[PDB]
């Protein structure tokens, strides 16, 4: 009866990447480079920020007093999200310690099927039987037990290793006739199988990746089915999963945000915190474009030399040198860009799931 098995400590013993970002002169691109009022205000702010995210995906506004290097130091500068060699077993202070303490199952489907036929073979009692169970049980949970003839008391069995936390991925479909937003960091009560757990799930798109790297969605996509990544006890039956929030304001104490099914119990799924820097190209020549309002120090431009530029018209490019001392810099682009286009910079960060707790009442 432990969520974190002692065997999880001896499984993930080989620390591969222990990279220190403090001893870096350039960005990490060495692979390819050189009470009701508070709730109302919070709901309004979340809706406005979701609308801003829909209009502008991941843009960050930089300040003249803001230093880009110190606040953007841990980010990376990879050119392609689905081709780069991301690693899952990196050591990071932002990672939870219980990432060390997880059960790492290799293949979900084969292990799940093996456990299902094991439960076929090792069933001591056959279905449909009048059976007496003596169960170990604490004293305090006795004093909220009611009589079974007035309220249903059902007993549900658990498979092998279902009590143990692991990184799990859920299907997430937006339930109809709620236009209300939901971020990827708020707690949400999730009922799967029979068990209810409070889960703060990371939202991602279910597009397949060769390196199993997926974009972290800040909010739920209102149109397409997303994938919710979290740390939770596993289910080996692929049970449908339901998602809600308890608020006693309604007659029902349920606001039902979504529905779905248990997709996978896989630890290889990481998420990418993407940070975008957007701005207007100042001046245009035949080959060299002088770009304005990226940074405010030329040494920031030097630190951002290797990471490529991209333009929302669909055109890649690179930097050449810092023109002025206010962030003006020369750059080379694939095509000819006007003043109505937006030049932008992409930075990427590792994102880890968070642990979950059971829900009662």
CSV table of N, CA and C in Angstrom, one decimal, residues 48 147 153 245:
chain,number,residue,atom,x,y,z
A,48,UNK,N,-9.7,36.6,-20.8
A,48,UNK,CA,-8.9,37.6,-21.6
A,48,UNK,C,-7.6,37.0,-22.0
A,147,UNK,N,-25.3,2.4,6.5
A,147,UNK,CA,-25.9,1.1,6.3
A,147,UNK,C,-26.0,0.7,4.8
A,153,UNK,N,-23.0,0.2,-1.4
A,153,UNK,CA,-21.6,0.1,-1.1
A,153,UNK,C,-21.0,-1.0,-2.0
A,245,UNK,N,-15.3,19.9,-12.2
A,245,UNK,CA,-14.9,20.7,-11.1
A,245,UNK,C,-16.1,20.8,-10.1
